[PDB]
Structure 1
Amino acid sequence: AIDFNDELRNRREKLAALRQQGVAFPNDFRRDHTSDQLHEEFDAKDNQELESLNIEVSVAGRMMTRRIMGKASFVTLQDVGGRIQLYVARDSLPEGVYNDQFKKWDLGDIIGARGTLFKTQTGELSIHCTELRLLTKALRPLPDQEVRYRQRYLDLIANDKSRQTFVVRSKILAAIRQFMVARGFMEVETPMMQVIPGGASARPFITHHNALDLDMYLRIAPELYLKRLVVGGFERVFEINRNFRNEGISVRHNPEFTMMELYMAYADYHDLIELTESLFRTLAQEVLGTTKVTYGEHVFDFGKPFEKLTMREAIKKYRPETDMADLDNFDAAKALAESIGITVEKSWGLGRIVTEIFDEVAEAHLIQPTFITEYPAEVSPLARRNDVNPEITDRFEFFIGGREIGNGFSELNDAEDQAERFQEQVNAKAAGDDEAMFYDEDYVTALEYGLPPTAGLGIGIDRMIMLFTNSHTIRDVILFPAMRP
């Protein structure tokens, strides 16, 4: 109870003393190795080899553990690469350092050491220090379960599993880029501030540009800009960045999240299906070392094709007692939708009701990688219309672990059609749909100049990261998740 305040007081007092000696917070010590480097290169060498090699190195990091055994101590130093042992002895360090300094430091203190590599009796790689310094005094001792999110640095200091998750996140993003670039895609940066937000259906965040006394929105999706670039000739473009949606936080939703949108001209959604499957197989193989990924109580084989069902097949499969004819009648569908708990809004049409039914009925059940095709036109204002059935579009979404991971389709490059669909979206917003799209005249204009047949795909990067790190909340894969005040 009070022992914590004694720790705080003790640290402030030790700092006070440092301040009296000179500059309390230096910036002079330089290391030449991180723990991981030392282990990779020297773990396989026995004390004999290391003795003759007589290799001196310099490291720096947090003092995680310290066992003072008189004239000698053993310390665990933790740096960006992991942990390495330090052998701190009174007679190995400059006169007085051991007793007048080292013993006065505290766990959590950032220290720097220079010494010779050797292996302990236990066979561990250790550094027999010849120099040791206190670089940063930690004023607080080393660390609900929401603390991990409110103070992610504490979580990173304490849990190696958490660190590994974020390190893997970086590996995945770098691997996606390498994968995309390998396919001739060029990464671009489109606006995140837009006067007319679009490219998706979501409530946007609105802000105001004082200089132009202009109200603007954080983008909910870069889609409309990326397709403008395809019209401009950048036929293989992709963007991996934030998108913002003024919607509530959840185990799969963060107000700001990372999405990858990619567009390749002269391709349709089938090409995107192949790309998605190869992307996941590549990432699993590349990042995890295997195509079979364990997630919760499941195992996803990214080495086998994703399952593929039309939206209706998924509805029928997960609610077998459904009279499929009900999805063809607005009243029947509205009734069905309502019977299962969906509040049917005045603005919704049959296509929207059917999609909502699909959401309620099947989504949570798509545990194994699944592609859901034949999305109704009503809910796909930017998707190419299907040649045989105008009421649906050449669009799909894919799910893994019961969550939507991506959304892709053959793009709508029919300007007149696009204009009309934007009008419907405007009507819908007038009819109450707060997520309906804004009319984007310049976008239509761009299509009038000619957009090559194209296939676009958006993938929720955070959700994707969850599947590769066995995380069951988006909060575990975003360094600083949105937290409630």
Structure 2
Amino acid sequence: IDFNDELRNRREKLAALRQQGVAFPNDFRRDHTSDQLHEEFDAKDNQELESLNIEVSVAGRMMTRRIMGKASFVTLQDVGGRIQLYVARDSLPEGVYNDQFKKWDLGDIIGARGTLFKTQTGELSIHCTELRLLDKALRPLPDQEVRYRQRYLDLIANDKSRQTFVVRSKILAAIRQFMVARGFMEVETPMMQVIPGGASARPFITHHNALDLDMYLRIAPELYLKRLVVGGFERVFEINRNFRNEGISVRHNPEFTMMELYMAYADYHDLIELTESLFRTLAQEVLGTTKVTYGEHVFDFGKPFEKLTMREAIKKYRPETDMADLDNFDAAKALAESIGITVEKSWGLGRIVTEIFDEVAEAHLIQPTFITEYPAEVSPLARRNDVNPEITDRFEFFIGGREIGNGFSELNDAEDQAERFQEQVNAKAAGDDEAMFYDEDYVTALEYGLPPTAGLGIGIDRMIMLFTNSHTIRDVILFPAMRP
């Protein structure tokens, strides 16, 4: 009703601008943004701003306007923030005030040129000697999911989302710097693979027409990264997007940004210290402090993370459990059923134990926590432990009740890797469509030999969630997946 009246009115105004000339001038140039004028002239008296004649030009969206009849006050908005404009009838060229400015609408992109002063409240404002219309907005300035469908409106309105994504950029940059300072080289491994691997999930399938070849979207860079380690890049990492067919969730998006790093001649303890130093560095550089407020909790990243094994977490958060039930398939299956887990025919003992850990523990790990000693069945790419060959040297890394990152001592054994891939093929035959495939090339690389290597990966979106006080992954991803 009233919205379509605005649409017709503004549309007819744009058409009138077409009538008389150029309605889309691209020639306007600005020498300043609001955040710069604030970061410089915020604390200066109107006496110093009057003696120094400082002319600036800015451009942005017109957010608010108050017309007082030959003097008007405008709120202008650009990347850095808001700056205030003083629009005077007799301080502009003839007719600009009455025949142009007063006919503009909120949301139109304009630009202004004037001298700096401060109002009676001490606010920095630009007395306008020139004002003109760069673009005419056809819709006026702006349920809970509409923020995610049209993110431009969310960015225009709420500054919390703006700060969230700016913080995301700053965090990514700080991560690249923290990795480079330690001697790691950032690479680009294929995003489209013939054989997907490196994790367990449903891959996306597409078709390459020129080669008539069905290819999968990457579920993990892992195998190609370790191939590059065989090549002799012994400190390597990739921060890039992986694709999984799983589905939408608060913690899940079909395409997400992940970091995977690998350093030779190290084990997973080095990656524990590397993780703690990573979060301490991002906490100090990105925000203010090692103490980060998240929801109803406070994370202290100057404090070492809590370390537990998987069985220690199961027994910790379910003390009534008999730990002998985890040494037998039938008792473990009965236990998992008692929790409410639906067991699959393809599941072995280790998988049942791990799922029991998922239902019992994961939701209770709030403070940052490392979970170690995973079974070999659910860790096909991880190095076997020396004392207990049925478990691998591995850890998953949890913050705020969700898995953040994953790291392990990589398995450089060729025959063992091939055999566990065989097990994964058997599992895929048994109905588990998240199971990996058999990759013969990676086995060949391991036969050319892979130095003892540790490797880590971290879902970046989860991390930025933790640092922005954002409780949904949709708040931290610019254009997440929707449900039409």
For each residue in 1:175-215, what CA deviation from the matched residue of structure 2 results, as whole angstroms up to 9, or x when unmatched?
A: 00000000000000000100000000010010000010100
TM-aligned CA deviation for residue 248 of structure 1? 0.8
Equivalenced residue count is 484
Equivalent residue for 1:238? 237
TM-aligned CA deviation for residue 5 of structure 1? 1.5
TM-aligned CA deviation for residue 147 of structure 1? 0.5
TM-aligned CA deviation for residue 306 of structure 1? 0.6
Distance 2:459 2:222 in 1: 14
TM-aligned CA deviation for residue 92 of structure 1? 1.2
Specify the SS of the correspondent of 1:264: strand
Alignment RMSD, CA only?
0.6
For each residue in 1:125-145, what CA deviation from the matched residue of structure 2 results, as whole angstroms up to 9, or x when unmatched?
A: 111111111111000000121
Equivalent residue for 1:420? 419
Distance 2:40 2:236 in 1: 40
For each residue in 1:393-439, what CA deviation from the matched residue of structure 2 results, as whole angstroms up to 9, or x when unmatched?
A: 11001100001000000000001110001000000000111111100
Distance 2:45 2:379 in 1: 64
Unaligned runs of 5+ in 1: none
TM-aligned CA deviation for residue 301 of structure 1? 0.2
Specify the SS of the correspondent of 1:17: helix
Query: Structure 1 runs of 4+ off > 2 angstroms?
Result: none
TM-aligned CA deviation for residue 347 of structure 1? 0.5
Matches of residues 151-230 of structure 1 in structure 2 within 5 Å? 151-230=150-229
TM-aligned CA deviation for residue 25 of structure 1? 1.1
Distance 2:268 2:91 in 1: 67
Which is further off, 90-99 or 453-462? 90-99
Distance 2:462 2:422 in 1: 32
For each residue in 1:226-258, what CA deviation from the matched residue of structure 2 results, as whole angstroms up to 9, or x when unmatched?
A: 000000011111000100000110000000000
TM-aligned CA deviation for residue 85 of structure 1? 0.3
Distance 2:240 2:382 in 1: 22
Specify the SS of the correspondent of 1:29: coil
Specify the SS of the correspondent of 1:378: coil
For each residue in 1:100-157, what CA deviation from the matched residue of structure 2 results, as whole angstroms up to 9, or x when unmatched?
A: 1111111110011111111111111111111111111000000121010000000000
Distance 1:103 1:218 in 2: 54
1:436 aligns with 2:435: yes
TM-aligned CA deviation for residue 9 of structure 1? 1.1
TM-aligned CA deviation for residue 52 of structure 1? 1.3
Distance 1:93 1:306 in 2: 62
Equivalent residue for 2:19? 20
TM-aligned CA deviation for residue 389 of structure 1? 0.7
Distance 2:440 2:397 in 1: 30
TM-aligned CA deviation for residue 24 of structure 1? 1.1
TM-aligned CA deviation for residue 289 of structure 1? 1.2
Equivalent residue for 2:265? 266
Distance 2:168 2:4 in 1: 37
TM-aligned CA deviation for residue 46 of structure 1? 1.4
Specify the SS of the correspondent of 1:174: helix
Equivalent residue for 1:64? 63
For each residue in 1:318-339, what CA deviation from the matched residue of structure 2 results, as whole angstroms up to 9, or x when unmatched?
A: 1111111111111000110111
TM-aligned CA deviation for residue 23 of structure 1? 1.7
TM-aligned CA deviation for residue 22 of structure 1? 1.0
Distance 1:52 1:280 in 2: 48
Specify the SS of the correspondent of 2:87: strand
Specify the SS of the correspondent of 2:211: coil
Distance 2:474 2:316 in 1: 31
Distance 1:253 1:43 in 2: 43
TM-aligned CA deviation for residue 82 of structure 1? 0.7
Equivalent residue for 2:108? 109
Specify the SS of the correspondent of 2:100: helix
Distance 2:45 2:75 in 1: 20
For each residue in 1:16-47, what CA deviation from the matched residue of structure 2 results, as whole angstroms up to 9, or x when unmatched?
A: 11000112111010011111011001101111
Distance 2:468 2:43 in 1: 29
Equivalent residue for 1:305? 304
Unaligned runs of 5+ in 2: none
Which is further off, 162-171 or 120-129? 120-129
Specify the SS of the correspondent of 1:176: helix
Distance 1:3 1:203 in 2: 47
Distance 1:193 1:50 in 2: 58
TM-aligned CA deviation for residue 91 of structure 1? 1.1
